Structure formats: C-alpha cells, structure tokens
DNA sequence: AGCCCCGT
DNA sequence: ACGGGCT
C-alpha cells in the first residue's frame, strides 16, 4: 500500500 | 538519500 | 555514497 | 501482495 520503492 | 546523502524515499 | 525507508 | 530514485 505505501509507495516510498514499489507502489502496490 | 538526498539528493544527496532521492529521498528516502522518492 | 546514501537523515534507505512502508503501509491499505 | 512490493521493490526506487540524483545530487
Ligand atoms: C500496502 O499497504 C502494502 C503493505 N504490505 C505489503 C507487503 C508485501 C507486498 C506489498 C504490501 N503492500
Ligand atoms: C521500494 O522499492 C522499497 C524497498 N525497500 C523498502 C524497505 C523499507 C521501507 C521501504 C522500502 N521501499
């Protein structure tokens, strides 16, 4: 859920 | 980090 | 080389 | 079920 490096 | 020393994160 | 970490 | 960006 977070997007800091992937954003799922 | 930074830039420099992007982000984190972005 | 890195206050490098995060939830819906 | 998920790996990313510039000084
Ligand atoms: C998003 O909120 C979120 C939280 N935990 C995860 C674990 C593994 C893959 C993706 C995830 N996304
Ligand atoms: C993004 O690809 C990414 C990878 N590893 C992490 C570890 C801890 C927090 C956030 C992260 N983000």
In angstroms, the CA B3 to CA A2 distance is: 21
Resolution (A): 3.2
In chain B, the DSSP E strands lie at none
Token readout for B9 is 């994160």
Looking at the DSSP bridge assignments, the partners of residue B2 are B7
Cα separation, B7 vs A3, whole angstroms? 12
- Report yes or no: B9 and A4 within 8 Å, Cβ to Cβ: yes
Distance B5 CA to C6 C1' (A): 20
Q: How far apart are CA A5 and CA B5, in angstroms?
A: 17
Give the CA dihedral B9, A2, A5, B2, nearest 10 degrees. Answer: 0
The bases of strand D with some atom under 7 A from any protein CB are 1-7
Experimental method: X-ray
Is there a contact between B10 and A6 (Cβ–Cβ < 8 Å)? no
Q: Which of chain B's residues have a Cβ under 8 Å away from the Cβ of A4? A: 7-10
Angle at A2 (CA atoms; ends B9, A6), nearest 5 degrees: 65
Please list the residues that pair with B7 across neighbouring strands.
B2
């Amino acid at each position: 859920x977070a997007x800091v490096x992937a954003x799922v | 980090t930074x830039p420099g020393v992007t982000x984190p994160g972005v």
